[PDB]
Design a protein around this ligand. Structure first.
Ligand SMILES: [Ca+2]
Length: 320
């Protein structure tokens, strides 16, 4: 133990879709990461928001996170926080930075679909092929109940259809018009923006990274095949001991066949770009980014716990 990860402002880790601080009160979303950061001197809190909701709206994830930030400030005596968001949690973090800029010192996004996900477009599109619309109603009920059951607090504020819509590429483009950011490049650019923003006189340091395990590697007869670069081909024990490895290769294959390019299974490199882009070269699928499942990663995957820890030190050296 030391103070390598000690920052001026408390860190709040912000989960994305499906999430909660602890699934069924047993499985940490941010697997082993709060513990590691705290061992290295960080003051770290883990948000518990609706697993299924929009980020805007009076009962959206953004207002939930705002309320939580205020409780963390009251508990610590601090005046600002460092927000670190995974996936949709990066969009939630952007919301709080926009609406309460005085309460935020930095925003870091990990595998965040700032431009939406082609996989959400796919799923939403699939639902349109039920001319009765019953598929949407039934599956929404199923997923909403999953949210209530797995939420550590059995949060009943779950809206699976709104969550899915939120993550589509068309809706994300609208979100970016409603919640513009100096850290974002132009729509369609596959570029980032500035490394900082000043909003109402409050400067925020902006950062991101992306996983790109899923690479398009062959095109035959109009069909694109991918390679999971996180793994030793086929034989990697991560394919056996973490069911998300092959699942994300599967969804990543859908992604590349919708023109996504390199991706983590559900978020493309281009969609993930925000602020100071620290790396898009990690050989990670989407769950590797949060040390999941249960710390299992392919042999070629960098250690995500060390990456996050090093970033806490980066924040410390940057003055936040
Ligand atoms: Ca994994």
């Amino acid at each position: 133990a030391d103070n390598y990860a000690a920052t001026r402002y408390p860190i709040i880790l912000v989960h994305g879709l499906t999430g909660t601080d602890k699934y069924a009160g047993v499985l940490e979303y941010w697997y082993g990461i709060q513990e590691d950061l705290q061992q290295r001197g960080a003051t770290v809190y883990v948000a518990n928001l609706s697993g299924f909701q929009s980020d805007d709206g009076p009962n959206g994830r953004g207002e939930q996170l705002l309320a939580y930030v205020k409780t963390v400030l009251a508990a610590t005596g601090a005046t600002k926080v460092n927000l670190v968001g995974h996936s949709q949690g990066g969009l939630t973090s952007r919301y709080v930075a926009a609406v309460a800029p005085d309460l935020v010192a930095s925003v870091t996004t990990i595998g965040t679909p700032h431009r939406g996900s082609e996989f959400a477009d796919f799923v939403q599109g699939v639902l349109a092929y039920d001319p009765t619309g019953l598929s949407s109603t039934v599956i929404a009920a199923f997923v909403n109940v999953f949210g209530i059951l797995t939420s550590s607090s059995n949060n009943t504020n779950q809206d699976a259809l709104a969550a899915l819509k939120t993550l589509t590429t068309a809706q994300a483009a609208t979100y970016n018009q409603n919640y513009p950011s100096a850290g974002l490049g132009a729509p369609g650019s596959c570029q980032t923006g500035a490394p900082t923003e000043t909003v109402g006189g409050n400067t925020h340091l902006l950062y991101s990274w992306a996983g790109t395990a899923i690479q398009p590697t062959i095109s035959v007869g109009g069909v694109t095949g991918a390679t999971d670069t996180s793994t030793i081909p086929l034989v990697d024990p991560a394919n056996a001991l973490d069911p998300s490895t092959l699942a994300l290769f599967g969804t990543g294959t859908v992604m590349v066949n919708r023109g996504s390019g390199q991706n983590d299974g559900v978020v493309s490199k281009c969609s993930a770009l925000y602020g100071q882009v620290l790396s898009t070269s990690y050989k990670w699928n989407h769950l590797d980014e949060i040390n999941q499942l249960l710390g299992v990663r392919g042999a070629n995957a960098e250690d995500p716990v060390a990456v996050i820890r090093t970033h806490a030190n980066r924040l410390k050296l940057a003055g936040v």
